Structures are given as structure tokens and as C-alpha cells.
């Protein structure tokens, strides 16, 4: 469960409420302790359930973090027929 | 954190080039739908 407020709540912009500043306990290297975390999420990733929110996907599926070291830039791929084709 | 001001993500598309692009698309669509029809473009109606 996330406890969130709006990021830059006094800002005049089109992005007024688009980024939410959420607080949560999560956990850490040792199973007996928890590390409180403050992070920013976009409105489209966080759904209401300080106000209480959850990540939009916790009602549908598991979330896997993409590796930060692997680029998403498209690279040309060629398709080659096997011999006989 | 956001350093500086919070700014909206956006895309820049030249208006003249796009308008010419659609004019070309409309001519090619008219070749299949009739020279005297009216072709209209609209935003996506719904879904995810």
C-alpha cells in the first residue's frame, strides 16, 4: 500500500497531478528490517485504493524490472533461409 | 527527483509536412473509395 501526495502540488502546468510522491515500507537486504522509500510515479502507473494507492498492475500481474544495463534501442535483424529454401 | 521545472513530454511534428503527407494519403485513398467522396480523419475512438 502506497501513501501518496501530488508532486509539485502548487505547480501551474499541464502536468498538475501527473507525478505523485509516494511513500512505502518495502523491505531490504535483511528480512527482519524494512527501509522506508519515497519515490515519484506517474499518474498512469498508480491507482487509488496522504491517500492510499497501489501500482496499477498489482491487480493483474507480476511486475519484472527490466535490467538497466540492456538497451531497448532497435537493432536491425536479418532473416536468412536455411539451406534448401 | 526532477531538477529544474517539471515539463510535459511532447512530440514536434512540422505542420506543413504532415499536411502534405495527408494530402498524398487522401489522393491514394480516393483512388479506392471514389474521386467524389469526402475523406475525414479523426482521433481514436477508444480502448487501452
Amino acid at each position, epitope marked *: 500500500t502506497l501513501q501518496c501526495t501530488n508532486y509539485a*502540488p*502548487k*505547480l*501551474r*502546468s*499541464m502536468m498538475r497531478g501527473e507525478i505523485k510522491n509516494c511513500s512505502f515500507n518495502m523491505t531490504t537486504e535483511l528480512r527482519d528490517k524494512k527501509q522506508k522509500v519515497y519515490s515519484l510515479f506517474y499518474r498512469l502507473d498508480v491507482v487509488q485504493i496522504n491517500k492510499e494507492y497501489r501500482l496499477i498492475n498489482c491487480n493483474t500481474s507480476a511486475i519484472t524490472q527490466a535490467c538497466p544495463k540492456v538497451s531497448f534501442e532497435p537493432i536491425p535483424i536479418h532473416y536468412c533461409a536455411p539451406a534448401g529454401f | 527527483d526532477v531538477l529544474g*521545472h517539471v*515539463r*510535459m513530454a*511532447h512530440c514536434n511534428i512540422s505542420k506543413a509536412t504532415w499536411n502534405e503527407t495527408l494530402g498524398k494519403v487522401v489522393k491514394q485513398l480516393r483512388k479506392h473509395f471514389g474521386n467524389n467522396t469526402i475523406i475525414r480523419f479523426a482521433q481514436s475512438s477508444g480502448g487501452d
Partner: antibody
Amino acid sequence: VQLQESGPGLVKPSETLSLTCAVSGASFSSFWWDWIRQPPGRGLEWIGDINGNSGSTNYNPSLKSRVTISKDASKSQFSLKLTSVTAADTAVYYCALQSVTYYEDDSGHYETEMAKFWGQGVLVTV
Amino acid sequence: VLTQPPSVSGAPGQRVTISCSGSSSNIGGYHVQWYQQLPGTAPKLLIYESNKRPSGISDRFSASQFGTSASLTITGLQSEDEADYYCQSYDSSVSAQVFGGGTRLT
């Protein structure tokens, strides 16, 4: 950054009042500019503003029907045109930098330190 | 629309505060700027965000905002500090930037 206000001194009742402000080192197109006035011995009233890029305007609803604000990026000038002027509605007029404007957001009004760059103003009588 | 004190006393060595009181449509949801002026001179701002100051303003001035009200604190009254103070904010009900009536410091 400097701003120099200029305009008429005594304007007769029902005549048009027109003021212009020029700025130096602040790029005109990068900021929102506004007009503020106060009679001597009285508080301040916001008149309206300009989006330095798009030309979009905003006016104080109590003044709106009698006030037009315009800009010219050439020569970095900002102008205010007020009609149906009366002695009850005169004041010392000022221009100030109001906020940062971005091309992607015509309603930005982004807060900035640069808003401190106020001119000294002119006294308008009627 | 943002109210301010009619005037305000103070002394060297004692904090002096100036308040503004508005609503959720003007102070509660928007930044409040603080200005200081002397008679015959244009105003200059002291605080450009609810908390942030320009690099040209001394540390004697600070401010905070809570709910639909805000307050400017002066850490001690100097003879050169007496001035007419104003707060400003954008009022989304009016759809205009709104000034308080200001206060006169003596």
C-alpha cells in the same frame, strides 16, 4: 535584466491610455510578462499578462472589458491599452517579469527567481 | 481575496510575522509569492515560491504555507526593514492573479 516603462502622463477622461515596456537582457519570448498597478496609498491590482511565445493573454475579470494587452517580439516590447479611463481608476503602472513560458505548455506560468526584475513604473493621472 | 493584517508591530530581536488567509482555490493549490516595497519605489519580491528566496535577499526573511494560509517571518526588525508587504497568488476561482491588501510595518 532591466525594464523601462514609458507612457502618457495626464490622459483625459474617456480617452485611450497606452503604455509600453522595453526590456534588455531577458529574451522576450522565454517569459510571461504582466502589468500591475497601484494608486499611491493603496494596494496593488493585477491587470493581465502575455505568453511571450504564443501571444495568449489573460485579464483581470473586473477590468477585462476595457483592457487589451499586446506584445511585439521585435524590439522586445510589451504594451497595454486601456479605454474608458476615469480618475477613480488611475494609478502608478508597472511591468514585471511574471514567469517562465515553454513552447510545449501555453498555460505553464512556471515560477522563477527572474520574476524579481521589476521596473520602477510611471504615474498616470486622469 | 487573500486577506492580510491591517498593520503590524515589531521590535529588534523579536520575530515579526505577516499572515495571508485565502482558500483552497488560491493559496491551498498555488504558490504564494512575497513582496516588499517602500513608498515611491517599485516592489521587489522577497520570496518567489512558497519557500524559496532569490540569491539577493538576506536570511532575515523566510516564509511558510499551510492549508489555505501562509506566513512571512522576519527574524528581527531593523530600522531599514519597515515597509509595505504584499502576498500574491493565482486564484483559480477568479481565474486571475490576486493580491492581498498588504500590511504596513512600523
